Design a protein around this ligand. Sequence first.
Ligand SMILES: Nc1nc2c(ncn2[C@@H]2O[C@H](COP(=O)(O)OP(=O)(O)O)[C@@H](O)[C@H]2O)c(=O)[nH]1
Ligand SMILES: [Mg+2]
Length: 217
Amino acid sequence: STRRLILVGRTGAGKSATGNSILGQRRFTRACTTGSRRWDKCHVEVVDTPDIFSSQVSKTDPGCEERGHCYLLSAPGPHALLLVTQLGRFTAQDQQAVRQVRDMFGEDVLKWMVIVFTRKEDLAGGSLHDYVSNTENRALRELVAECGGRVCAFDNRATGREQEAQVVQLLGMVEGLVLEHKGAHYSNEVYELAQVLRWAGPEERLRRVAERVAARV
Ligand SMILES: Nc1nc2c(ncn2[C@@H]2O[C@H](COP(=O)(O)OP(=O)(O)O)[C@@H](O)[C@H]2O)c(=O)[nH]1
Ligand SMILES: [Mg+2]
């Protein structure tokens, strides 16, 4: 009935392009933004993210207002976090983005995480399972295992049936994950505060949610 996804990862990973592919729209910038698509009888909601996963987030988003906005847009919690990364370019910056995500949501959030690889065409027609299996990048290897081997490849220039197939594959994985959690979305003490304060006005809700995020990072 509803699937809430959040796109996370470094700047230039391909978050915005991936979101456009999923939504089938040219939808996706200092702020979090959102889009959605009605598929069958399911409402797929995608939150795209700005520069909030760098080592400079502390200077870019000092009172955690933008990190707070991400929570409000995804409340009561995501069914999956999509960690977007570029095929052949898993860098120190990608590793920094993963740590920011952990800091921002909690260690348990990797149990709701799917890794999306952009630039699929760089496999030159070869499979992703082989590429993931034979990479010399230890840190990528580790991350894939921490995310239960949930990996998926996108060519964000794909249109037509090639695009439908990559999106269908990703949504299948998200369903798999949701069933693993017996239908539960990810939650923590910040999402709970957002829900508790759901009757309050948007200004106090944002202020108090930003405040809870700041206390934990
Ligand atoms: N060739 C190719 N380019 C891509 C793909 N995905 C993203 N890009 C390009 O990578 C650049 C950064 O992507 P963007 O979505 O803006 O990254 P973001 O900062 O993570 O939102 C853009 O110029 C995209 O066109 C892909 O699958 N194939
Ligand atoms: Mg972007």
